[PDB]
Amino acid sequence: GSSGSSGRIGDGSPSHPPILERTLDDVPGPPMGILFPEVRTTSVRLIWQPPAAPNGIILAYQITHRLNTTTANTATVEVLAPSARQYTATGLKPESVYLFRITAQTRKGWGEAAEALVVTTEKRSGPSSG
């Protein structure tokens, strides 16, 4: 009796690790997308967005409004819900500038904060640059 045989070898199969994999906890980042669509004298309304990298369930947010140039003791910051993308600021002095600091609240605390300035007036103005 007798017989023979033969074959060939080979292999290959690349892959990639899945993103969005937070092992540890940590406060969120700065809320980007701070634009002022509606801004009046003593009443403004800006809109922001959540941080692509929350790295933690948002419990709420904070919007600090104050006069960039004025006097006082502190700034009356307001806490928003974790499902708040926009906010309304009432009781602002016209013919001035206000700094809007947006922040989120997690199980760790308050992470980065997005600062956005907005003037109070009826005359629309926007240089757009930088």
mmCIF file with all atom_site columns, C-alpha atoms in Angstrom:
data_model
loop_
_atom_site.group_PDB
_atom_site.id
_atom_site.type_symbol
_atom_site.label_atom_id
_atom_site.label_alt_id
_atom_site.label_comp_id
_atom_site.label_asym_id
_atom_site.label_entity_id
_atom_site.label_seq_id
_atom_site.pdbx_PDB_ins_code
_atom_site.Cartn_x
_atom_site.Cartn_y
_atom_site.Cartn_z
_atom_site.occupancy
_atom_site.B_iso_or_equiv
_atom_site.pdbx_formal_charge
_atom_site.auth_seq_id
_atom_site.auth_comp_id
_atom_site.auth_asym_id
_atom_site.auth_atom_id
_atom_site.pdbx_PDB_model_num
ATOM 1   C CA . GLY A 1 1   ? 0.000   0.000  0.000  1.00 0.00 ? 1   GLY A CA 1
ATOM 2   C CA . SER A 1 2   ? 0.898   3.671  -0.197 1.00 0.00 ? 2   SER A CA 1
ATOM 3   C CA . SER A 1 3   ? -0.452  7.195  -0.487 1.00 0.00 ? 3   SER A CA 1
ATOM 4   C CA . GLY A 1 4   ? 0.372   10.881 -0.244 1.00 0.00 ? 4   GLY A CA 1
ATOM 5   C CA . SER A 1 5   ? -1.054  14.252 0.720  1.00 0.00 ? 5   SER A CA 1
ATOM 6   C CA . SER A 1 6   ? -0.332  17.952 1.063  1.00 0.00 ? 6   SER A CA 1
ATOM 7   C CA . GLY A 1 7   ? -1.875  21.285 1.977  1.00 0.00 ? 7   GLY A CA 1
ATOM 8   C CA . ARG A 1 8   ? -1.188  24.944 2.661  1.00 0.00 ? 8   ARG A CA 1
ATOM 9   C CA . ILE A 1 9   ? -1.100  27.205 5.694  1.00 0.00 ? 9   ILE A CA 1
ATOM 10  C CA . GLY A 1 10  ? -2.348  30.740 6.219  1.00 0.00 ? 10  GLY A CA 1
ATOM 11  C CA . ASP A 1 11  ? -4.219  33.076 8.536  1.00 0.00 ? 11  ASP A CA 1
ATOM 12  C CA . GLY A 1 12  ? -5.078  36.699 9.217  1.00 0.00 ? 12  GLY A CA 1
ATOM 13  C CA . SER A 1 13  ? -7.789  38.702 10.937 1.00 0.00 ? 13  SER A CA 1
ATOM 14  C CA . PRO A 1 14  ? -7.166  42.211 12.284 1.00 0.00 ? 14  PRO A CA 1
ATOM 15  C CA . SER A 1 15  ? -9.410  44.064 14.705 1.00 0.00 ? 15  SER A CA 1
ATOM 16  C CA . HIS A 1 16  ? -9.849  47.253 16.695 1.00 0.00 ? 16  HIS A CA 1
ATOM 17  C CA . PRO A 1 17  ? -10.676 48.123 20.311 1.00 0.00 ? 17  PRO A CA 1
ATOM 18  C CA . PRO A 1 18  ? -14.093 49.603 21.116 1.00 0.00 ? 18  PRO A CA 1
ATOM 19  C CA . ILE A 1 19  ? -14.159 53.271 22.047 1.00 0.00 ? 19  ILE A CA 1
ATOM 20  C CA . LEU A 1 20  ? -16.230 54.935 24.743 1.00 0.00 ? 20  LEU A CA 1
ATOM 21  C CA . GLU A 1 21  ? -14.875 52.684 27.468 1.00 0.00 ? 21  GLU A CA 1
ATOM 22  C CA . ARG A 1 22  ? -14.537 54.564 30.736 1.00 0.00 ? 22  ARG A CA 1
ATOM 23  C CA . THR A 1 23  ? -13.052 52.415 33.475 1.00 0.00 ? 23  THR A CA 1
ATOM 24  C CA . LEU A 1 24  ? -12.836 55.002 36.229 1.00 0.00 ? 24  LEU A CA 1
ATOM 25  C CA . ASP A 1 25  ? -15.123 57.916 37.004 1.00 0.00 ? 25  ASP A CA 1
ATOM 26  C CA . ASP A 1 26  ? -14.409 61.601 36.516 1.00 0.00 ? 26  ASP A CA 1
ATOM 27  C CA . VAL A 1 27  ? -16.220 64.893 36.053 1.00 0.00 ? 27  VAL A CA 1
ATOM 28  C CA . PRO A 1 28  ? -17.245 65.914 32.529 1.00 0.00 ? 28  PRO A CA 1
ATOM 29  C CA . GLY A 1 29  ? -15.415 68.340 30.273 1.00 0.00 ? 29  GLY A CA 1
ATOM 30  C CA . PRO A 1 30  ? -16.187 71.853 29.013 1.00 0.00 ? 30  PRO A CA 1
ATOM 31  C CA . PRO A 1 31  ? -19.584 72.284 27.342 1.00 0.00 ? 31  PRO A CA 1
ATOM 32  C CA . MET A 1 32  ? -18.889 73.261 23.752 1.00 0.00 ? 32  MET A CA 1
ATOM 33  C CA . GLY A 1 33  ? -21.324 74.904 21.365 1.00 0.00 ? 33  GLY A CA 1
ATOM 34  C CA . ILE A 1 34  ? -22.014 78.079 23.306 1.00 0.00 ? 34  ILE A CA 1
ATOM 35  C CA . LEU A 1 35  ? -23.989 80.380 21.042 1.00 0.00 ? 35  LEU A CA 1
ATOM 36  C CA . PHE A 1 36  ? -26.322 83.274 21.760 1.00 0.00 ? 36  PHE A CA 1
ATOM 37  C CA . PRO A 1 37  ? -29.319 83.115 19.413 1.00 0.00 ? 37  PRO A CA 1
ATOM 38  C CA . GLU A 1 38  ? -31.686 85.188 21.516 1.00 0.00 ? 38  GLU A CA 1
ATOM 39  C CA . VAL A 1 39  ? -30.166 87.992 23.555 1.00 0.00 ? 39  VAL A CA 1
ATOM 40  C CA . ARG A 1 40  ? -32.125 91.011 24.727 1.00 0.00 ? 40  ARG A CA 1
ATOM 41  C CA . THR A 1 41  ? -31.506 93.830 27.174 1.00 0.00 ? 41  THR A CA 1
ATOM 42  C CA . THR A 1 42  ? -32.647 92.452 30.509 1.00 0.00 ? 42  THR A CA 1
ATOM 43  C CA . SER A 1 43  ? -33.375 89.034 29.054 1.00 0.00 ? 43  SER A CA 1
ATOM 44  C CA . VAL A 1 44  ? -31.083 86.734 27.110 1.00 0.00 ? 44  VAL A CA 1
ATOM 45  C CA . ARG A 1 45  ? -31.144 83.107 26.033 1.00 0.00 ? 45  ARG A CA 1
ATOM 46  C CA . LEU A 1 46  ? -28.087 81.104 25.050 1.00 0.00 ? 46  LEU A CA 1
ATOM 47  C CA . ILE A 1 47  ? -27.703 77.464 24.086 1.00 0.00 ? 47  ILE A CA 1
ATOM 48  C CA . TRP A 1 48  ? -24.967 74.958 24.826 1.00 0.00 ? 48  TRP A CA 1
ATOM 49  C CA . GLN A 1 49  ? -24.299 71.279 24.230 1.00 0.00 ? 49  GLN A CA 1
ATOM 50  C CA . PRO A 1 50  ? -23.122 68.264 26.239 1.00 0.00 ? 50  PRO A CA 1
ATOM 51  C CA . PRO A 1 51  ? -19.468 67.186 26.246 1.00 0.00 ? 51  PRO A CA 1
ATOM 52  C CA . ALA A 1 52  ? -18.921 64.391 23.753 1.00 0.00 ? 52  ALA A CA 1
ATOM 53  C CA . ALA A 1 53  ? -16.917 62.965 26.630 1.00 0.00 ? 53  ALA A CA 1
ATOM 54  C CA . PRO A 1 54  ? -19.175 63.053 29.697 1.00 0.00 ? 54  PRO A CA 1
ATOM 55  C CA . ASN A 1 55  ? -17.239 60.300 31.428 1.00 0.00 ? 55  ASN A CA 1
ATOM 56  C CA . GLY A 1 56  ? -20.022 60.344 33.992 1.00 0.00 ? 56  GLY A CA 1
ATOM 57  C CA . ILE A 1 57  ? -23.794 60.622 34.124 1.00 0.00 ? 57  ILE A CA 1
ATOM 58  C CA . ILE A 1 58  ? -24.799 64.269 34.264 1.00 0.00 ? 58  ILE A CA 1
ATOM 59  C CA . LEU A 1 59  ? -26.793 65.103 37.372 1.00 0.00 ? 59  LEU A CA 1
ATOM 60  C CA . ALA A 1 60  ? -27.354 68.712 36.380 1.00 0.00 ? 60  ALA A CA 1
ATOM 61  C CA . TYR A 1 61  ? -25.688 71.874 35.133 1.00 0.00 ? 61  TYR A CA 1
ATOM 62  C CA . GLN A 1 62  ? -24.777 75.368 36.269 1.00 0.00 ? 62  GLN A CA 1
ATOM 63  C CA . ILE A 1 63  ? -25.026 78.704 34.497 1.00 0.00 ? 63  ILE A CA 1
ATOM 64  C CA . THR A 1 64  ? -23.200 81.580 36.146 1.00 0.00 ? 64  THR A CA 1
ATOM 65  C CA . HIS A 1 65  ? -24.262 85.013 34.956 1.00 0.00 ? 65  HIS A CA 1
ATOM 66  C CA . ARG A 1 66  ? -22.413 88.168 35.932 1.00 0.00 ? 66  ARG A CA 1
ATOM 67  C CA . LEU A 1 67  ? -21.415 91.560 34.581 1.00 0.00 ? 67  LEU A CA 1
ATOM 68  C CA . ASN A 1 68  ? -17.950 91.461 33.062 1.00 0.00 ? 68  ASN A CA 1
ATOM 69  C CA . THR A 1 69  ? -17.686 95.068 34.177 1.00 0.00 ? 69  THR A CA 1
ATOM 70  C CA . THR A 1 70  ? -19.595 96.127 37.270 1.00 0.00 ? 70  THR A CA 1
ATOM 71  C CA . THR A 1 71  ? -19.759 95.917 41.045 1.00 0.00 ? 71  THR A CA 1
ATOM 72  C CA . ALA A 1 72  ? -21.194 93.456 43.537 1.00 0.00 ? 72  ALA A CA 1
ATOM 73  C CA . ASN A 1 73  ? -20.260 90.658 45.909 1.00 0.00 ? 73  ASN A CA 1
ATOM 74  C CA . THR A 1 74  ? -20.593 87.588 43.719 1.00 0.00 ? 74  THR A CA 1
ATOM 75  C CA . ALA A 1 75  ? -22.445 86.134 40.756 1.00 0.00 ? 75  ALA A CA 1
ATOM 76  C CA . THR A 1 76  ? -25.847 84.513 41.095 1.00 0.00 ? 76  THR A CA 1
ATOM 77  C CA . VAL A 1 77  ? -25.235 81.140 39.489 1.00 0.00 ? 77  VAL A CA 1
ATOM 78  C CA . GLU A 1 78  ? -28.165 78.929 38.563 1.00 0.00 ? 78  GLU A CA 1
ATOM 79  C CA . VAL A 1 79  ? -28.211 75.144 38.573 1.00 0.00 ? 79  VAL A CA 1
ATOM 80  C CA . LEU A 1 80  ? -29.950 73.442 35.674 1.00 0.00 ? 80  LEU A CA 1
ATOM 81  C CA . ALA A 1 81  ? -31.071 69.867 35.138 1.00 0.00 ? 81  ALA A CA 1
ATOM 82  C CA . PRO A 1 82  ? -28.915 67.164 33.537 1.00 0.00 ? 82  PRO A CA 1
ATOM 83  C CA . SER A 1 83  ? -31.208 67.431 30.537 1.00 0.00 ? 83  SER A CA 1
ATOM 84  C CA . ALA A 1 84  ? -30.809 71.158 30.012 1.00 0.00 ? 84  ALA A CA 1
ATOM 85  C CA . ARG A 1 85  ? -29.054 72.354 26.879 1.00 0.00 ? 85  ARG A CA 1
ATOM 86  C CA . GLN A 1 86  ? -30.332 75.916 26.965 1.00 0.00 ? 86  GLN A CA 1
ATOM 87  C CA . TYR A 1 87  ? -31.146 78.534 29.574 1.00 0.00 ? 87  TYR A CA 1
ATOM 88  C CA . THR A 1 88  ? -32.736 81.938 30.041 1.00 0.00 ? 88  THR A CA 1
ATOM 89  C CA . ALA A 1 89  ? -31.140 84.842 31.869 1.00 0.00 ? 89  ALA A CA 1
ATOM 90  C CA . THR A 1 90  ? -33.507 87.517 33.121 1.00 0.00 ? 90  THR A CA 1
ATOM 91  C CA . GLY A 1 91  ? -32.824 90.674 35.093 1.00 0.00 ? 91  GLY A CA 1
ATOM 92  C CA . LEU A 1 92  ? -29.699 91.883 33.333 1.00 0.00 ? 92  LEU A CA 1
ATOM 93  C CA . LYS A 1 93  ? -28.506 95.451 32.917 1.00 0.00 ? 93  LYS A CA 1
ATOM 94  C CA . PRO A 1 94  ? -28.606 96.608 29.288 1.00 0.00 ? 94  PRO A CA 1
ATOM 95  C CA . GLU A 1 95  ? -25.646 98.188 27.537 1.00 0.00 ? 95  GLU A CA 1
ATOM 96  C CA . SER A 1 96  ? -23.158 95.825 29.135 1.00 0.00 ? 96  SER A CA 1
ATOM 97  C CA . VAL A 1 97  ? -21.509 92.430 28.854 1.00 0.00 ? 97  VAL A CA 1
ATOM 98  C CA . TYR A 1 98  ? -22.294 89.259 30.764 1.00 0.00 ? 98  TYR A CA 1
ATOM 99  C CA . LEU A 1 99  ? -20.130 86.183 31.189 1.00 0.00 ? 99  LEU A CA 1
ATOM 100 C CA . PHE A 1 100 ? -22.034 82.918 30.978 1.00 0.00 ? 100 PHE A CA 1
ATOM 101 C CA . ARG A 1 101 ? -20.256 79.963 32.537 1.00 0.00 ? 101 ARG A CA 1
ATOM 102 C CA . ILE A 1 102 ? -21.831 76.616 31.731 1.00 0.00 ? 102 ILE A CA 1
ATOM 103 C CA . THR A 1 103 ? -20.934 73.568 33.788 1.00 0.00 ? 103 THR A CA 1
ATOM 104 C CA . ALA A 1 104 ? -22.171 70.059 34.477 1.00 0.00 ? 104 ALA A CA 1
ATOM 105 C CA . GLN A 1 105 ? -22.631 68.163 37.721 1.00 0.00 ? 105 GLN A CA 1
ATOM 106 C CA . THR A 1 106 ? -21.635 64.535 38.126 1.00 0.00 ? 106 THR A CA 1
ATOM 107 C CA . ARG A 1 107 ? -20.955 62.053 40.902 1.00 0.00 ? 107 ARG A CA 1
ATOM 108 C CA . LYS A 1 108 ? -17.465 63.505 41.086 1.00 0.00 ? 108 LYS A CA 1
ATOM 109 C CA . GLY A 1 109 ? -18.527 67.137 41.042 1.00 0.00 ? 109 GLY A CA 1
ATOM 110 C CA . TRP A 1 110 ? -18.395 69.975 38.541 1.00 0.00 ? 110 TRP A CA 1
ATOM 111 C CA . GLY A 1 111 ? -15.971 69.537 35.668 1.00 0.00 ? 111 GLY A CA 1
ATOM 112 C CA . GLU A 1 112 ? -14.770 72.035 33.090 1.00 0.00 ? 112 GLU A CA 1
ATOM 113 C CA . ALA A 1 113 ? -16.905 75.094 32.451 1.00 0.00 ? 113 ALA A CA 1
ATOM 114 C CA . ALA A 1 114 ? -17.626 76.863 29.184 1.00 0.00 ? 114 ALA A CA 1
ATOM 115 C CA . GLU A 1 115 ? -17.366 80.631 29.429 1.00 0.00 ? 115 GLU A CA 1
ATOM 116 C CA . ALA A 1 116 ? -19.368 82.685 26.958 1.00 0.00 ? 116 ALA A CA 1
ATOM 117 C CA . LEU A 1 117 ? -19.791 86.445 26.977 1.00 0.00 ? 117 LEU A CA 1
ATOM 118 C CA . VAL A 1 118 ? -22.946 88.173 25.797 1.00 0.00 ? 118 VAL A CA 1
ATOM 119 C CA . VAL A 1 119 ? -23.853 91.839 25.549 1.00 0.00 ? 119 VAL A CA 1
ATOM 120 C CA . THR A 1 120 ? -27.270 93.210 26.426 1.00 0.00 ? 120 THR A CA 1
ATOM 121 C CA . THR A 1 121 ? -28.903 95.337 23.755 1.00 0.00 ? 121 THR A CA 1
ATOM 122 C CA . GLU A 1 122 ? -31.397 95.417 20.909 1.00 0.00 ? 122 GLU A CA 1
ATOM 123 C CA . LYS A 1 123 ? -28.815 96.200 18.253 1.00 0.00 ? 123 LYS A CA 1
ATOM 124 C CA . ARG A 1 124 ? -27.419 92.931 16.953 1.00 0.00 ? 124 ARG A CA 1
ATOM 125 C CA . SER A 1 125 ? -23.638 92.796 16.861 1.00 0.00 ? 125 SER A CA 1
ATOM 126 C CA . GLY A 1 126 ? -21.247 90.022 15.905 1.00 0.00 ? 126 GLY A CA 1
ATOM 127 C CA . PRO A 1 127 ? -17.693 90.494 14.614 1.00 0.00 ? 127 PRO A CA 1
ATOM 128 C CA . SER A 1 128 ? -16.987 86.777 14.502 1.00 0.00 ? 128 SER A CA 1
ATOM 129 C CA . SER A 1 129 ? -13.257 86.131 14.510 1.00 0.00 ? 129 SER A CA 1
ATOM 130 C CA . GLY A 1 130 ? -10.573 84.103 16.244 1.00 0.00 ? 130 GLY A CA 1
#
